[PDB]
Design a protein around this ligand. Structure first.
Ligand SMILES: [NH3+]Cc1cc(-c2ccccc2)no1
Ligand SMILES: [NH3+]Cc1cc(-c2ccccc2)no1
Lengths: 348, 348, 348, 348, 348
């Protein structure tokens, strides 16, 4: 017996939808849901989605509160919809998927993922929920996550990190590293060998290797000397060049984090969403050096060093394809006289 | 001669409604009030209330700009309406009360609190305003604050802190500690003996006793040893247990402040309002330990230690009622073999 | 061939309007522009202006992304409209000017500033764009900026700082110091000798002279002694008096920055816009000292010291006019027995 | 090259989307699309749909302007989507279908109905458009309309009337009677024998048989005598009983039309949509007789007489199923002593 | 002392703005203005304009309530703004002009039309208001209306009809026929010889000549015989051809009125505004004959006959220009063998 007043009762009393019985008085005005608390209206939810306010409130209340794959991973794996859960996209303040299965009467296309409407969609399945591994085996299209082995299914080890209530973390009290599986047209697909992005923030960036500790602590020329990166244009690509009106390089998150400690800068996130490669309109506050489209990726410095050192440096320009977060990321590699000039995630 | 243009003139020229004559051009679009300044529209107010935009703008302009009791105190005392002022609720960005008395023609139920419509309502009176002590004596229901003694009225010493323009502070240049008085059905009511919450923030938490300085500086086991808290489950209740998927304890603000210095965490304020006990959906970023409903109270550590040490520890589970901010707060006390297992502000 | 879908394509692919061909799917709901990215809506723009959402989105996409004069300078110079560009006002999240010339079909009053509709308006011209110096020579009213000399035109050296994508900075990789020129009724006007405001923030305030370094580092009495400021009421005007309910003085940004390091305080920006003098409703969190209208100016301490020391101190009260950012700023100077009592930017 | 400005140009110049090149200035405010005409804003469209305003404007501009099947017929035949057109639902002021095929980038699930996403959907095909009879030949699910014979397919003669720009009419200058074909999972279905509703209005009702002319002209008792309708409760079912507080019968549109000529009444259309049976909250203005749910069907009186005269009248109450507009309509038949008491389209 | 509350007081008590003192409580919600009447909100105004709700409410309250020229006339004469009045455009539910002079602080560009901002605008002047004939004497650009003679100026006799509170009428108790004067750049213009549109409605159409009485009463062939109209294609142009899918001719309002008496039809007013020629998407309900863009003009039948009989009929196709309502209306004239095939107001 689903209702707006029951969803609101669950939010007020349980912090989210918890299947509890009860009703609280609710008022909807414009895009906000309020509840009366001791004579006055208290805001429960502000709709930032393109769905109706009461519908978005219900999907947000029904969000998955266990560590789940980051939306960029689900997107890279072609996930269209989730089986009997809502993956909330905290970067967009919206449901990661348009439709639902067995969640909300307004957005449901089916009650169970076995319904024929779900067959052409890549349904996300969670092995931590009873019966979901079986539903994946029976699904025409799907993505499955598990905490352990599934008999006969060849796994793909996913990233160490997962999103728990919008906080990306490597779990200590909970498991965040999942086995990943995918099916296309009834056939289990071999997930490719891949690097993973580290999902760090600029302001609270922490190094995850001795090379990253050395990058943040050492001066530019001694880090390049220590790690034998001469001729690999780290001065441009990673450290960034702030000497001309157009900001040069600065494509690795660690390089932005290093710069941020010394001088602040504005990063305009003009397409705010979770993605393997992010595009920012950057303006350096100290110099005035800027770039409309600065592609930034958060790779572990060792992984980036491994990618660039593996490259043939004998051609002027070429596309270098690298699997990152299960997706093919195109990089533009520019060389001259056997040395790198630039290497960046190619702006489509 | 009240008007939208006159209220806006006062905001622009006086920083708030100050009874000054004058008009400025105003435009209202959706929920925002703008004023024309040198040919362009400048935002004066964004309506976050459930009242009409022009009405909410007037109540906000007419807000009390002197140190006033925090909304949680007024609510705990049963205050329905204020006499000839607006107590602005900065936690909700809205008037603390639905109706007004002698403030705004759209929200007024009366011009004076002596009107019979006010008799069944608990009217808030401010002894710092001429004639308000007399109006309280004549009111059927009411709450009065004063800076000094009222002849024959037995006072209740309120908290040291008050809210001045949304800033909770213990006044040095202004008085923030008031005497409190209450009347129910024409009869002056004895306010109970009470503890007070400290109204501190997580990010700018400052200790207000030697015990609080010792809690923040000493390690867990030496603080428990120094203050003889063995068998009182401070490891769980105050420090917090981040070892399991469900976050254990963590019900005192000081414990959250200590944790915040070392590791960050998300506190989802799912019912955003001022209250003695706050409920948060907490997610620890370091471990992934989380709790949908984590009740948090900001008591002075000495007061919490005094409350828990006063308890009989011979029963498995019982409700412990403690007067805090004039309200009865129920705590759930769980014991085993004469020692505390947990003690928390009981989730209703 | 201008279109909503083409503007959105440019934002998504180029970080702003860049004259590129292409279209992306767009949805408009209420005041927000979204684009479909892999099946889900992603927010591109939230309209905070009084213009229609699609119109404001286009003007924001078409904003000038080169270092431009800060809006306070343009306003002080009487600028009504810009020639073939949009000066985006980042303090208001809106176009600095109501109308456009050769920018957007909904806001354009003309395609070229030579059209007779532009003659009575003070058009902003940018010498860095080909043909704009010539358009200024032919304009009846206008303001021109250049990076160098214009034959026969007597220049005015503007501030060192300019706004680049909303970041106020003194350019190192780009030029931010412009020559300024103005015409009124076909006649080139002599711009007056002026001081410039420093455009600093409270939280990231940096001293720009040895006197400012000494103000932030030295104690009040030794700074006043070192710079011979006895009898100039710096204790009141610059340092601020937090001993009474009404906050005394505190009119220089550097004094607020010094106070902010020790004790936090709330600054209510009740008219949020760029201006030479700013008015704040200030509440000191430590003491509870407050002021509804506290005028604050960010002058270099040396310039303020030079202004106040140049004053005749023999009259009780008088208006002192000082040219700052090309505008006449009135200050109220109060003296007693040949010493300053107060000196503040006069509240109109 | 689809765009908001181009759609608006087509509406302004061609009365609808006509594939013409050009752009007009547009402004979007709340749910309304305006265009500038000689300096002032002129309303082009008001969004009454649940889609974004600019998306709904485009679908409405791209509506089919030829006589098309009434939405109730398409719904009764299970139509999910239309092939390369928009069937505009004038009763709801909205698109008849959620998604489109080759119409609008925001709503399109495919560009051609041959795409595999369309195979499980019942696609509407219009034989008047080149290649659509052939697209229905290879479609898995679909409904086809034609003006003539299709080789190899036996036709189902549809209603005489069609909707042309929201006007339901029997065409004289255009053909409105179509042949209907339907296929489910690649198999051409045998459409059932069906009656059709007449789709008339209460205020402009015209009789379409000699029996209907006699019903409107003759008195109740002489019409029942002429057509030998004694014992079939036409006094209750068709004429209506306005003698008690609850309005009795009145389930045939012709009976409402007859009553409307003499006395006015209110019909509250509480579910405003096109449907074979309509439900109204009726209040008779003359008597005050009313009914919350009065089911009304517009059958040709001869067809209703044939249905009621082809029923067994020996049971107290039973469900009578009748194919009307290709759907199964349940009627509740109530009898006593071999005579009808009531017969109405069953409220379920 | 202008105010929202004072404007509302005038609307409630005087039916419009009447300069009366007083205030009523007002609430603004979305685009609607309400007033409290005995405890409940009563709607005063719904904003259908692109201006802010409170601004549009004031301009509507301040509308001219005397018979004024129809907006189509003012537009055709190039009127930009009115002197100290608001011409309310009832066809658009909006002010006829963007800006005002001495009316509303939000829309005013000047207080008096003698201000230099008004010199390049064609200001509307009303000789019925004291001093306006004299203000037109010294205005650079303007249109003047008078009820009588102006010394030194030759008049242009305007239409018999004017708009009084949105009702177009030929005044009997008030004068609606004005003398028109116009000046461009200080020079009094010679207004051209012009026909006038009759501004009639389809449903309440009344003939204004013996020819119009004969058109409405006689059959098609005897009217054409009586007025010797053989070969002028009145059967197509005026009567309309409803025999093919595309509706033929039907460009004179009188022909639509004649058709409307016999058979109803839908006229979709896709550009709702006052104009000399109107464009409708017409659907004939009886036949299904339709036309996306059917240009309709309401000329007196005698005037249309004079125009068509004063043309050379020897060319296949040509543009015929006719001054109607002071503007040049282009007609497309199509001939064959010395006879008219069609003649219609040119869709451009
Ligand atoms: N072979 C199954 C089938 C045949 C058709 C079909 C459709 C149109 C004409 C003739 C045949 N549609 O499905
Ligand atoms: N001298 C040029 C001129 C004359 C007028 C004018 C206007 C009204 C009456 C008589 C003259 N308007 O412009």
């Amino acid at each position: 017996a689903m209702s707006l007043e029951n969803v609101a009762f669950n939010v007020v009393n349980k912090g989210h939808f918890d299947g509890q019985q009860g009703e609280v008085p609710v008022s909807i005005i414009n895009n906000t849901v309020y509840t009366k608390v001791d004579g006055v209206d208290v805001e429960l939810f502000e709709n930032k989605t393109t769905l109706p306010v009461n519908v978005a409130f219900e999907l947000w209340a029904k969000r998955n509160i266990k560590p789940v794959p980051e939306v960029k991973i689900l997107n890279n794996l072609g996930v269209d919809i989730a089986a009997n859960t809502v993956i909330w996209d905290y970067k967009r303040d919206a449901p990661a998927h348009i439709s639902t299965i067995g969640v909300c009467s307004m957005t449901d296309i089916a009650k169970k993922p076995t319904e024929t409407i779900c067959a052409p969609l890549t349904v996300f399945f969670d092995g931590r929920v009873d019966g979901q591994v079986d539903l994946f085996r029976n699904a025409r299209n799907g993505v499955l996550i598990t905490e352990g082995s599934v008999k006969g299914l060849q796994p793909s080890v996913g990233p160490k990190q997962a999103s728990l209530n919008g906080v990306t973390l490597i779990g200590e009290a909970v498991k965040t590293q999942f086995n990943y599986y995918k099916k296309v047209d009834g056939v289990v697909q071999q997930l490719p060998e891949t690097y993973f992005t580290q999902s760090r923030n600029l302001q609270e960036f922490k190094p995850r290797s001795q090379m990253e500790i050395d990058f943040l602590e050492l001066a530019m020329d001694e880090f390049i000397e220590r790690y034998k990166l001469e001729g690999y244009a780290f001065e441009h690509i990673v450290y960034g060049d702030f000497s001309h009106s157009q900001l040069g390089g600065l494509h690795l998150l660690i390089g932005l984090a290093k710069r941020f400690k010394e001088s602040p800068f504005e990063l305009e996130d003009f397409i705010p969403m979770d993605s393997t490669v992010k595009n920012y309109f950057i303006t350096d506050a100290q110099t005035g050096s800027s770039k409309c489209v600065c592609s930034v990726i958060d790779l572990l410095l060792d992984d980036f060093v491994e990618i660039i050192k593996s490259q043939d440096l004998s051609v002027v320009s070429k596309v270098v394809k690298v699997t990152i977060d299960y997706t093919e990321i195109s990089f533009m590699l520019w060389c001259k006289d056997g040395h790198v000039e630039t290497f960046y995630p190619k702006l489509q």
